[PDB]
């Protein structure tokens, strides 16, 4: 039957019961030993309350805010004598403040994004740099430096960011094998970075194609997606952002860097969900993706950075998202950006409203001796329905990663603040793999210069096909 | 008891029996009186043959080519007893050559596009300038200068190009009436140009939104559209092209002009169907359109040019297409450009496969004292089904414009080569209006700087919202 990995001894407080909370609850119930009365869900929504009541789970209908979070969460995180687990799956809440609260009260923590308090983004005097995921991430790195060790808190452990960090490692191992590079698999960050450098990985796309299709035609003035509409829109309006590789020789005139921090990233002064890049996945083959900002674009490039004695980077891969969302979401973006406003209404596709499709989510490592290698999941909606309730394929990749992260945290409860790149990738993938459908690695001869130049002249660098100059779509 | 407009005392030869041919034939049968055996349809397609045969239509299965066109068409067009009519609704045939042949033999002619012989649109030595609609239109204008007068031949009389030229004239009249710039209705080209100048019309979008939705999901690797896929892809891969107004103070670095010809146009060194512009229609409100090249963009701007004594343009409007095609075609374009190749298959939406929706097609005159005014048709699929068989709402707007052009040519059969702009707009709209559903004029306060600048800096011109600099999408 289903494996039970650990006993949870304290309260489980799930913040948020949207598409991911709903998918994660049944996995938590399935894979951990605890009395159900120990778990409670907090979410302000009436729809969420109704679903919770049908599922027989404790529910508190409240919005967690900067003004109430200490008063509200401390009693819940500290109920009884066991160590609790805060599972944060919300929007509009500060990941940093909640995480720090959990740690100071001895509870484990996990989330899937570095989220700021409601109001952060539409503040009048917020500079574009301050709206970046690089800056949000630096607040978490800062917290780690300020309080080393202590109770484990896992930042950004969803599908992406999260799982894709584990795929990068598995892909590096596979590439090393296929290129005839033999030796000890790496066990430290410095060794992972050197492996990437040695293999000649110039960069990495988080290369995703969602083919889930709805049982109804897209309504006008409704934003449709397979996961958070609020979350997608929020990240889509942040600056286009990327981990910036040492091999790059060109950047747009509207690119900018950062004065402080780890140094791994740049951003563009334009929204990521309206920025296209040339990418590839096995089912899609050549496609456009959107350059949406994501924590892993920075965290993976930072993680795989090799520095010299002086502390300067000698190697770092480029890393960014190349997202082709579901058809209705592509239409929803076209509608949003063309109108200049958010749609009147929105909805997230339920599994019962999906006629077919997969969430093809993987990592595309390029520039090495086999040109490009894609490693990841081809999870279908049909498989998802069989193996995990109350979610679509997009949801299951995320919720199963949260599960893997929780397993790791309970097995390593005094690791301090950690990112998915800090977790044991094999253990995490061992826990996750049952929920990923086919996981495959395939090589391709495709490059961003495929079929170029064509009818019209373009600004391309023919000496090096993988340069960002060739990837970025100039509109 | 639909009205009959004219007797036709000679052969009617329809070249092409695709989406438009299938919608046009029943209107011809409805509105003209002729020996029914005098009509014949020529198309190489097996699908076209089976359709025609199941309806008792006289059919020749052949491709009209550079090699066979004289031998094939002369006998059909001159079969008598009186003057024939060549109705060209094909792809991959030369409009110019067929039109000149019909004229040499005294047959009336009509088409909906200036099309070249097969093979034109890919050459080792075809410069982008020579692929432009401006250049193709210059061959028609040259033909007219070469042989003035004679038998009427109507160039580019579909919905757009075609009907929209009549809409521009009606809109100019309406604007004037609303603003009391009233007087004699213009009767000459120069008077129309001066009315546009006196109203302060800085430019015109052919502003279209197709909301027809398919009853089936978007198939992978199939291009879907509501009219010719071959035709749409062809124009979509031509350079983005526009009539270029005297008020414009900026153009892209990749813009180019022409050494000769009417002087009314420029082109961009990029594909039109991958070029976005900010536009507006009544149902969509603010939307993106694609800057797809079209004959009317040049013909309307040329028609409304005012010249001083020396002969240089002192006034001309900007004019271009701002096309939001149906949801499935938007996705088809994203797929084609992202993949860098044409899909393996294609499908035109039949009326029976459309859930609901309209083809909202009009002209948006901007820059004048009332900011912006949209005039056009909001024909629904439901109304289309009640009034005309075998077509969707896109098709009916085109087929009814061909009907109107045919009526005009029969009424004025010695007018020489003529464009839509040369026809009597009131008579054509009288004929066409029963097939257009609601035809409305709407003012708006929208401009291309609505909501700008916003979260990010952009190169905009705040002194004049309507500058192309502000319309063109440059992320
Ligand atoms: N790493 C990844 O792979 C990944 C993937 C998907 C989603 N996400 C992120 O995970 C989070 C959840 O995604 P989702 O699809 O479930 O979103 P969702 O929009 O479906 O649900 C969000 C929930 O948060 C609740 N909420 C809003 N404000 C709150 C508050 N102040 N306190 C408590 N709850 C509040 C809402 O009522 C809602 O039920 C989002 O932040 C999203 O960006 C990450
Ligand atoms: N002005 C406008 O508003 C407008 C609107 C729609 C279409 N169009 C144009 O009208 C034309 C027809 O459109 P459609 O939607 O019917 O296209 P379609 O692609 O449905 O049909 C084209 C037909 O032409 C036939 N054909 C191909 N090669 C031929 C040849 N060598 N000789 C004879 N026939 C040949 C094909 O077999 C096909 O049946 C196209 O050129 C299109 O671009 C103009």
Residue numbers in the entry:
A (entry chain A), B (entry chain B): 3 to 477
Question: Mind quoting what the paper says about this structure?
Answer:
In contrast to its eukaryotic counterparts, bacterial HSS synthesizes 1 mol HSP from 2 mol PUT. NAD+ serves as a non-covalently bound prosthetic group for BvHSS.
The phosphate-binding motif (18GFGSIG23) is located in the loop connecting β-strand 2 and α-helix A of the Rossmann fold. The active site is situated between residues Asn-162, Trp-229, Glu-237, His-296, and the nicotine amide ring of NAD+ at the narrow end of the pocket. Residues Val-115, Val-116, Tyr-123, Asn-135, Leu-138, Pro-163, Gln-240, Thr-295, and Asn-297 form a side pocket at the “heel” of the “boot-shaped” binding pocket, which is filled with six ordered water molecules of which five occur in a nearly planar and equidistant five-membered ring.
